[PDB]
Design a protein around this ligand. Structure first.
Ligand code: NAG
Ligand code: NAG
Ligand code: NAG
Ligand code: NAG
Lengths: 352, 354
């Protein structure tokens, strides 16, 4: 019977935790302290040239959205499948490298935006405004909402698309000047969690974070549902990945599954599996075609339970989406659930 | 004794590393280096994108560079790595329009203009010869669609004037597109592809009499890159960018501007140094955003490559291209584009088919 190595870089998690297919996995767990480039790059590069790994489940307990980016880099460059289960390693990275084998647990920005519009579809929150920064996905996000609108009989009214540049000094309060334009009950904000907090301190400043205005945000903004910033407004409705029923160890199992089912299907039909990564520095197109193939399996996977398929794009097809709310006590409370179709909300009359 | 600030650089040859070591120095003479004083740390390209990106960390971030000049991979390591920290990267010869996206390379500056800006000339050209209906053939990749935008943006001034046929990069037989283009029945044709891909268009269009009289073939620089002329229709028009390949001339002017602007930075209170390691640091260099603001707002006359201004995206604001007509087997230059207006050479245009 044939082994496949599966490294499990787990960044800060004091936890721990069922298969009858053709390849048996040789899992080997590992933790790391740092989430910087050289730190992340060099861990995965060694667990190969030493331990003959073949794919990576990777989770962290941080909001470092750039972890996702460093992992896409490492994957494309070594043609090794990397899975990002939790944390910044799973905040949707909008466009990935062509050659990449990196998939993340969580919805497409387009999924979320479609959720967010289903949420105003309920309470008829039809007059709104999109805000973005230049984080990867602003265009996809804004266009996705703009698209749903244009061809609806329903009276959506989109008052302003604000695009904020955060790569400058901020020394001129142009951002402050820019949000002056904003005056709408629903304002949608696409930006990182670190980017979010500054947009609020200026919104609180301009009296837009006052009551009478409602700010919806995607998962990444919420991020760690435990950490609720001062600068965050009370009531920042958000989508988030429903860890409530979906445990961390519950993920890592599914990580192991996908990769191993993928290998297992591939052996069944093609009667061979990628030879374990030779070296981080050993890069060929001798592995271009095997890699392209295994990606086709990685993306179409069924386990004991549900459909764990991904898209070619990196996001997850049918994720575990939960809507949440920042209450008076600075806590995140499940207000709504996105069944695989329609959404069940908690409150008919929105909490006045 | 003064503050020693570093400038990094990833350079194509060990010789260029010296032209950069010296450039930093002529700046450390022209200044007046008593509070701050620059210091030049540099590497050669490592061919592997990971080896490269580790080097940015170990060889350059470790030295707390305030910026890095750049010359199996393109600068994506130096940008993903230092760009994490927001240390401004300055590309000296990179023409690819990918790097003009703030979303993906937010601390990025380049001394050459992206290929997409050839559209500017393509536009002013159409104004000169009153081309009102053109067919745009573009690789369906970021570089091709990059070009399609800039040209179309330019046509807004008053997108019906261009009909667009895209194609999957790497396609071999292109008659299907082309015969669709022949049904679309246009005389003018703008191309955006690589050498190898334009080659394929160049061939398939030869099989259909689209290389001949009546047609105009307008084009960029990769599209008449080397190996691509063997098959390009006589009477094409291409572009080569003036002094866009001189890694040495660009090391000169960049250091001048970084120098001018590293000095510019220290007029401010509340200044902080970029991280030493890569290891352990996972927060942006705090000032690196302001530093980027400075470089951008820096203008430089009497630069060896010309006046070095910077647009909203941190590309070179103005640029000159030697226009090029192919005739028989010689690539005569029928005019230059002075960054603003076209100026024809004494040699006249020999269209496709005399
Ligand atoms: C697998 O892919 C097919 C298309 O080949 C798709 O229609 C199907 O829904 C996918 N099934 C699962 C279980 O993901
Ligand atoms: C391209 O394809 C067409 C039909 O699909 C064929 O007639 C033609 O010969 C092909 N050209 C080459 C060079 O193979
Ligand atoms: C390129 O730069 C070198 C300096 O190394 C200079 O001597 C030469 O004239 C330049 N070439 C062109 C064509 O400008
Ligand atoms: C710089 O920091 C000082 C405190 O050290 C503060 O008083 C000042 O306002 C800061 N400058 C700016 C422009 O905020």
């Amino acid at each position: 019977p044939p082994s496949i190595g599966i490294a499990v870089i787990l960044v800060g998690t004091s936890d721990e935790v069922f298969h009858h297919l053709s390849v048996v996995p040789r899992v080997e767990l590992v933790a790391m302290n740092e989430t910087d480039p050289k730190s992340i790059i060099t861990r995965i590069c060694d667990l190969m040239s030493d331990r003959k790994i073949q794919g990576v489940v990777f989770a962290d307990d941080t909001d470092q959205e750039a972890i996702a980016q460093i992992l896409d880099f490492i994957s494309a460059q070594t043609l090794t499948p990397i899975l990002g289960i939790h944390g910044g390693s799973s905040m949707i990275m909008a466009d990935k490298d062509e050659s990449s084998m990196f998939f993340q647990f969580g919805p497409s920005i387009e999924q979320q935006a479609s959720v967010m519009l289903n949420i105003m579809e309920e309470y008829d929150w039809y007059i709104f405004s999109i805000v973005t920064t230049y984080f990867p996905g602003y265009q996809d996000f804004v266009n996705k909402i703009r698209s749903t609108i244009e061809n609806s009989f329903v009276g959506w009214e989109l008052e302003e698309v604000l695009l904020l540049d955060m790569s400058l000094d901020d020394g001129d309060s142009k951002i402050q000047n820019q949000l002056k334009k904003l005056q709408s009950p629903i304002i949608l904000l696409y930006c990182t969690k670190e980017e979010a907090t500054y947009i609020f301190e200026v919104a609180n400043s301009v009296g837009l974070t006052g009551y009478g205005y409602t700010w919806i945000v995607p998962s990444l903004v919420a991020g760690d549902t435990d950490t609720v910033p001062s600068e965050f407004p009370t009531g920042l409705i958000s989508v988030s990945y429903d860890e409530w029923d979906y445990g961390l160890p519950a993920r890592v199992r599914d990580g192991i599954a996908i990769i191993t089912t993928a290998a297992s299907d591939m052996l069944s039909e093609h009667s061979f599996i990628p030879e374990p990564k030779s070296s981080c520095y050993n890069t060929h197109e001798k592995r271009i075609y095997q890699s392209n193939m295994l990606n086709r399996y990685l993306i179409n996977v069924t386990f004991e339970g549900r459909d764990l398929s991904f898209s070619e794009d990196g996001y997850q097809m049918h994720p575990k989406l939960v809507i949440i709310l920042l209450n008076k006590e600075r806590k995140w409370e499940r207000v709504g659930k996105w069944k695989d179709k329609s959404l069940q909300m908690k409150y008919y009359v929105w909490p006045r | 004794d003064p503050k020693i600030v570093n400038i990094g650089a990833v350079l194509s040859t060990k010789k260029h590393e010296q032209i950069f070591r010296e450039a930093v120095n002529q700046a450390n003479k022209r200044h007046f280096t008593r509070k701050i004083q620059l210091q030049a740390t540099s590497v050669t390209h490592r061919p592997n994108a990971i080896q490269m990106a580790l080097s940015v960390c170990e060889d350059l971030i470790s030295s707390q560079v305030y910026a890095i000049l750049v010359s199996h991979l393109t600068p994506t390591p130096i940008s993903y790595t230092a760009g994490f920290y927001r240390i401004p990267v300055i590309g000296l010869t990179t023409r690819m329009s990918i790097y003009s996206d703030k979303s993906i390379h937010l601390s990025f500056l380049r001394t050459v203009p992206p290929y997409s800006h050839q559209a500017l000339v393509w536009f002013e050209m159409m104004r000169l010869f009153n081309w009102n209906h053109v067919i745009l053939i573009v690789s369906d990749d970021h570089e091709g669609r990059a070009a399609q935008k800039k040209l179309e943006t330019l046509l807004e001034g008053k997108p019906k004037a261009d009909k667009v046929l895209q194609f999957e990069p790497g396609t071999k037989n292109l008659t299907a597109l082309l015969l669709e283009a022949k049904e679309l029945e246009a005389r003018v044709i703008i191309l955006s592809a690589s050498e190898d891909d334009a080659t394929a268009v160049y061939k398939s269009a030869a099989m259909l009499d689209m290389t001949g009289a009546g047609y105009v073939w307008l084009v960029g620089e990769r599209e008449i890159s080397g190996s691509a002329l063997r098959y390009a229709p006589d009477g094409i028009i291409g572009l080569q960018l003036i002094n866009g390949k001189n890694e040495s001339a660009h090391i000169s002017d960049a250091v001048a501007v970084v120098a001018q602007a590293i000095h510019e930075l220290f007029e401010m209170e509340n200044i902080t140094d970029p991280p030493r390691g890569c290891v352990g640091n996972t927060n942006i260099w705090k000032t690196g955003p302001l530093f980027k603001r400075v470089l951008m707002s820096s203008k430089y006359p009497d630069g060896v490559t010309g006046r070095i201004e910077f647009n909203e995206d941190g590309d070179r604001k103005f640029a000159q291209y030697s226009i090029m007509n192919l005739q028989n087997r010689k690539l005569v230059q029928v005019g230059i584009f002075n960054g603003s207006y076209i100026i024809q050479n004494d040699r006249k245009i020999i269209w496709p088919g005399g």
